[PDB]
From a paper:
Here, we present a cryo‐electron microscopy‐based structure of bacterial translocon SecYEG in lipid nanodiscs and elucidate an early intermediate state upon insertion of the FtsQ anchor domain. Thus, we used an extended scaffold protein MSP1E3D1 and POPG/POPC lipids to reconstitute SecYEG into nanodiscs with a diameter of approximately 12 nm. Thus, to investigate an early stage of the TMH insertion, we prepared translation‐stalled ribosomes, which exposed the first 48 amino acids of FtsQ, including the TMH within the nascent chain, and incubated those with a 10‐fold excess of SecYEG‐ND to achieve complex formation. After sorting and refinement steps, the ribosome structure was resolved at 3.3 Å, and independent refinement of the SecYEG‐ND:RNC complex elements led to 3.2 and 3.1 Å resolution for the small (30S) and large (50S) ribosomal subunits, respectively, and was limited to 6 Å for the lipid‐embedded SecYEG due to its small size and apparent dynamics relative to the 50S ribosomal subunit. In spite of the loose binding of SecYEG to the RNC and its higher flexibility, the complete architecture of essential SecY and SecE subunits was resolved, and a single‐helix density proximate to the SecY N‐terminal domain was assigned to TMH 2 of the SecG subunit, while TMH 1 could not be reliably detected. However, our structure revealed a very different organization of the complex, as SecE TMHs formed a helical hairpin in close proximity to SecY C‐terminal domain, and the hairpin was tilted within the lipid bilayer by ~30°. Surprisingly, the periplasmic loop of the SecE helical hairpin reached TMH 8 and a short helix connecting TMHs 7 and 8 of SecY, and so appeared in direct contact with the lateral gate of the translocon, thus suggesting a potential role of SecE in the translocon gating mechanism but also explaining interactions of SecE with nascent TMHs soon after their membrane partitioning.
Numbering used by the authors:
A (entry chain E): 1 to 18, 21 to 41, 60 to 118
B (entry chain Y): 18 to 37, 43 to 296, 300 to 426
Amino acid sequence: XXXXXXXXXXXXXXXXXXXXXXXXXXXXXXXXXXXXXXXLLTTKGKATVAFAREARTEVRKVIWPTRQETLHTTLIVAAVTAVMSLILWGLDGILVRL
Amino acid sequence: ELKRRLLFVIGALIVFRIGSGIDAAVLAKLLEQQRGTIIEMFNMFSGGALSRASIFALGIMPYISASIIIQLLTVVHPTLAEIKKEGESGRRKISQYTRYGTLVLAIFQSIGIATGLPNMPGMQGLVINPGFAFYFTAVVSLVTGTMFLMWLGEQITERGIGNGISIIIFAGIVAGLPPAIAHTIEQARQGDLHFLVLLLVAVLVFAVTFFVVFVERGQRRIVVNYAKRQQGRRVYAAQSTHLPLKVNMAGVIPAIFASSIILFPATIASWFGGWNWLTTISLYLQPGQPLYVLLYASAIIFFCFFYTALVFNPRETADNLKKSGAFVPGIRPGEQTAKYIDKVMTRLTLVGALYITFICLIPEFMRDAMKVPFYFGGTSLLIVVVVIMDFMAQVQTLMMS
């Protein structure tokens, strides 16, 4: 079961189409994906399916919407970005000035 | 003290950001050009080393590029697989051999430039011509600069805090920002930049950061229980304490790694005119194409598995749990608990690096739609938010101590 990656290769070459050599390279790598698919892939499929059950299991640890922790994070990163920018200004204004 | 470690690293990186035969104005003209998106990428990775035309032009990118290489030598060359696993001694000889691969990589990369990039006093300058005295002085100044940065980063990882190099480039791009935003608001009074799209890029930046911090909010805490009565009789409970295991670690390692491995072959390999097929392949190697970012992603996730597997050593953690007196009722201690935490941590962190690659890919489509390049990039937004978050959490964490 390596089929979905090759369908994704078809989709990625179709995205790369719309200027001929790059679309040909995307098609060539899609052909390489099919060559890998010509002959583990079903075990990779079942592994990723297991990983998606694990994903959901780990979704249960994802903290649901909180506007407060959002604003905490928000203001933290806004503050930190302002800090780095003030660092950057204190350095490059007088350094470029000099 | 602890106050002096932070103000020593701060001072070191402040004279780094001041110090960070080629007429540089010509290059400053060349960086206003599309179709080589990777140049702008080199000024992010360089946080502006080739915009400022630094003395160290590509930075610390060779060093990180060796740290992956050796991990291959752990796999291949079992004689090498035995010396990597050989314990304490031998490792500092491997670290000096990583240094010696770096140094021959800086030699090799200077060859790659002065063969590949130049062959014109626009790409070169007036003092440094295609003679081997100019070639040699060029290589000498660029390798001496990268060595200075290598030594300074071997003093800051040890007697200073964390990484540092991340923050070096990071402050290079934040201080590269005000002209770039000056240009955007000059083109905002022009119809080049439309005001709807520019506030759209400001809000997509804000919502991707929100997604980052949402991936950071819920982690996964495993409640383990301790039944403990201290023999002093001041006995209260059987207490269930969660181990709040966290996702992706201390600087997304395959992003920085993958970026060094992206930017090495486009200068050295693809720039050989004299061979022609190799030059054509280098020209194709443009990050306007989905193939490169897919292969980079596959690299990153595999590399992420490896790096994370490096970070934790689950048996020590498990021994600690036996030492600290907590138990998950029903699972055999040791290997089964080991195997358990390992499979689960893999399955989580893999999803983490996946969504990391998802937040990584979209800004590039934003950069195709807007015309953005190595500036607001899908790789660097994430790494800057996580370095700042990490260090301030580690600062509060070590402020309790």
